[PDB]
Amino acid sequence: AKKILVTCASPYANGSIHLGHMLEHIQADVWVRYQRMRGHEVNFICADDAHGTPIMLKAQQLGITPEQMIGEMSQEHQTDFAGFNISYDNYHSTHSEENRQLSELIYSRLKENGFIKNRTISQLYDPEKGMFLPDRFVKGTCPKCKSPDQYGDNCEVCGATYSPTELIEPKSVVSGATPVMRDSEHFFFDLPSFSEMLQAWTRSGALQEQVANKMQEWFESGLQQWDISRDAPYFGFEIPNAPGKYFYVWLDAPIGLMGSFKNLCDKRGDSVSFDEYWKKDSTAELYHFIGKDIVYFLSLFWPAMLEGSNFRKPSNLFVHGYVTVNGAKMSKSRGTFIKASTWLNHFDADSLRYYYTAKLSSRIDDIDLNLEDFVQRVNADIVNKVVNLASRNAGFINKRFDGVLASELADPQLYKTFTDAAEVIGEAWESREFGKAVREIMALADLANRYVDEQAPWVVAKQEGRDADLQAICSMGINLFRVLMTYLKPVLPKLTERAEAFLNTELTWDGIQQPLLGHKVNPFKALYNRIDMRQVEALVEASK
């Protein structure tokens, strides 16, 4: 009955999707699929973050227009996300007419309300290329240790940090020319004006404890005005009434989510939903799944921008940690910096979705993909606990009972124990306590397999006149499988489709209250095969 708009952080167009991105998109998708299972109106929205100096320069290097380049990466990204079954209702681009209009609208409202300031700043400028240089596009000699070819505000030899203006014999990374300081008028968003409102939100109790504590650190350090303009040449949106000035990519990026929803509504011919979700009086819920590295933008700048332009603010922010492989940050040299596209050449999407989900929680802690554990856990939980309930019982049903399940539950009490768990498991999915949900589900899977072992179908099957007993036992196991797969439906989309084909029924949350009785099931190839370390080693080698 609820109206829910869920988003993920837009990936930058100048890089491929990797395991880090996947943690976020998978976490959001699991939540979204669960919400849909409970009957809510859900809109899962995302887009590609396509603006900025890095993108402009990359396109020039490739000898193609930025439009062509971002279009190609947009397609690559969507192909990868589709491969992992991330169920977006719309995947748009920050480089769109919807975002241009909404960005200009919000800026205009902020300006009229007195939240935009004008001030001149001094910045390194490449006189040959003819452009201001972001810090990472300036290189030179470290002022401290004198090591050459250091980039930006830090030295990778002695570890010193400094303003790029301190670099000795500075050189433009773009042209090799010596940059010089040049003045430029910039537009600033008055974030400080929203301090009280933001502090009230922080203490409201909606945000994760860890996020709130971090925000207090930021309030203590003090909020500052935000530089939201960038000089031409730039790939982005030009600022109205300010020739040669553009909106900094980060200003238009989150607005791109609004743009993506507007685009969806417009394509659907829906003239009412945009305002219903974004106006101040909205009764719809808005959630953003994001990583801790961008919390400053989404928890401070964003709500302030919306407030200042008369739009509703986020209902909540769901923050996740970093993804590590084998306990450490992804390493290219070790072949642990894994691309989403590469992953799919070796393993299926469900395996990673399951592993991440088993480790995820409502906190911001990092999630570790230990490859040895990945093999053991997938084989133990998916193949040996859940799918086992179907694979060890389906054969007898198809071969000896024409594929027809028993007319009654052999153990109603046990079945009730399984359906009684729906409340706690659903609450776990709802609260994003994924690890807890999986633990509950697997504990039930253990009970199901214990039941089968107690009945010993491999013994009953060889004994005279025990046909009825065999059908009863095997049918009971299949019904327990039906329940478990329902609880796991948000997690394993593909295995779920195969399970639904086998069971000849769509799995719904409430449907578990009615077991499958005197019901025909279909034969199946192999619902889920085992994986091994040889495959893991191949994945790593292919990633080097």
Ligand X SMILES: [N-]=[N+]=NCCCC[C@H](N)C(=O)O
**Residue 10 binds which entry of Zn ion, ligand X, none, with Cβ cut-offs from 5 to 8 Å by kind?**
ligand X
Contacts of 18 (CB under 8 A, 6+ apart): 330, 337, 338, 339, 340
Helices 349-359 and 19-37, axial angle in degrees (round to 10): 80
Size of the site for Zn ion (CB under 5 A): 8
**Residue 239 binds which entry of ligand X, Zn ion, none, with Cβ cut-offs from 5 to 8 Å by kind?**
none
By beta-carbon proximity to ligand X, the closer residue of 252 and 348 is: 252
Q: CA 316, CA 294: separation in Å to the nearest integer?
A: 15
**Residue 294 binds which entry of ligand X, Zn ion, none, with Cβ cut-offs from 5 to 8 Å by kind?**
ligand X
Q: Is 298 in the site for ligand X (CB under 6 A)?
A: yes
By beta-carbon proximity to Zn ion, the closer residue of 105 and 160 is: 160
For residue 119, the cross-strand partners are: 186
Q: CA 366, CA 343: separation in Å to the nearest integer?
A: 20
Q: What is the DSSP letter of 16?
A: -
Do the annotations mark residue 474 as ligand-binding? no
Report yes or no: 207 and 201 within 8 Å, Cβ to Cβ.
Answer: yes
Q: Is 24 in the site for ligand X (CB under 6 A)?
A: no
Interface residue with ligand X, options 4, 6, 10, 309 (CB under 6 A): 10
Q: CA 67, CA 50: separation in Å to the nearest integer?
A: 9
Give the x/- contact pattern for Zn ion in 124-143, rule: CB under 5 A.
Answer: ------------------x-
For 369, phi then psi, to 5°, come to -95, 90
* CA distances for 367 relative to 19, 26, 540, angstroms: 11, 13, 18
**Residue 155 binds which entry of Zn ion, ligand X, none, with Cβ cut-offs from 5 to 8 Å by kind?**
Zn ion
Interface residue with ligand X, options 253, 330, 452, 516 (CB under 6 A): 253
Q: Is 133 in the site for ligand X (CB under 6 A)?
A: no
By beta-carbon proximity to ligand X, the closer residue of 264 and 298 is: 298
Q: Is 235 in the site for ligand X (CB under 6 A)?
A: no
Report yes or no: 49 and 382 within 8 Å, Cβ to Cβ.
Answer: no
Q: CA 355, CA 536: separation in Å to the nearest integer?
A: 14
* Nearest partner of 327 among 292, 358, 371, judged by Cα: 371
End-to-end CA distance of the chain: 48
Tokens for 95, please give them: 């480089």
Q: Is 155 in the site for Zn ion (CB under 5 A)?
A: yes
Q: How far is the CB of 305 from ligand X (least distance, A)?
A: 11
> Which H, E and C letters describe 193-216, residue by residue?
HHHHHHHHHHCCCCCCHHHHHHHH
Q: CA 159, CA 143: separation in Å to the nearest integer?
A: 11
Do the annotations mark residue 332 as ligand-binding? yes
Report yes or no: 388 and 457 within 8 Å, Cβ to Cβ.
Answer: no
Q: How far is the CB of 278 from ligand X (least distance, A)?
A: 15
Q: Judged by CB under 6 A, which stretch of 3-11, 120-128, 139-147, 472-480 contacts ligand X? A: 3-11
Q: CA 539, CA 54: separation in Å to the nearest integer?
A: 30
Q: Is 320 in the site for ligand X (CB under 6 A)?
A: no
Strands in 138-141's sheet, in edge-to-edge order, are 150-151, 138-141, 168-172
**Residue 145 binds which entry of Zn ion, ligand X, none, with Cβ cut-offs from 5 to 8 Å by kind?**
Zn ion
By beta-carbon proximity to ligand X, the closer residue of 49 and 381 is: 49
Distance of alpha carbon 533 from the chain centroid: 27
Interface residue with ligand X, options 236, 254, 259, 493 (CB under 6 A): 254
Tokens for 179, please give them: 């940059």
Do the annotations mark residue 145 as ligand-binding? yes
Give the x/- contact pattern for ligand X in 464-503, rule: CB under 6 A.
Answer: ----------------------------------------
Interface residue with ligand X, options 4, 5, 6, 12 (CB under 6 A): 12
* Nearest partner of 532 among 379, 345, 341, judged by Cα: 379
Q: Judged by CB under 6 A, which stretch of 161-169, 193-201, 250-258, 404-412 contacts ligand X? A: 250-258
By beta-carbon proximity to ligand X, the closer residue of 10 and 208 is: 10
Q: Judged by CB under 5 A, which stretch of 122-130, 152-160, 273-281, 357-365 contacts Zn ion? A: 152-160
Q: CA 517, CA 520: separation in Å to the nearest integer?
A: 9
Q: What is the DSSP letter of 380?
A: I
Size of the site for ligand X (CB under 6 A): 13
**Residue 253 binds which entry of Zn ion, ligand X, none, with Cβ cut-offs from 5 to 8 Å by kind?**
ligand X
Length of the chain, please? Answer: 544
Do the annotations mark residue 155 as ligand-binding? yes
Interface residue with ligand X, options 24, 29, 49, 126 (CB under 6 A): 49
By beta-carbon proximity to ligand X, the closer residue of 23 and 387 is: 23
Q: CA 480, CA 460: separation in Å to the nearest integer?
A: 19
Q: Is 428 in the site for ligand X (CB under 6 A)?
A: no
**Residue 394 binds which entry of ligand X, Zn ion, none, with Cβ cut-offs from 5 to 8 Å by kind?**
none
Give the footprint of Zn ion on this chain (CB under 5 A). Answer: 142, 144-145, 147, 155, 157-158, 160
Task: Give contact residues for ligand X (rule: CB under 6 A).
Answer: 7, 9-12, 49, 253-254, 257, 288, 290, 294, 298
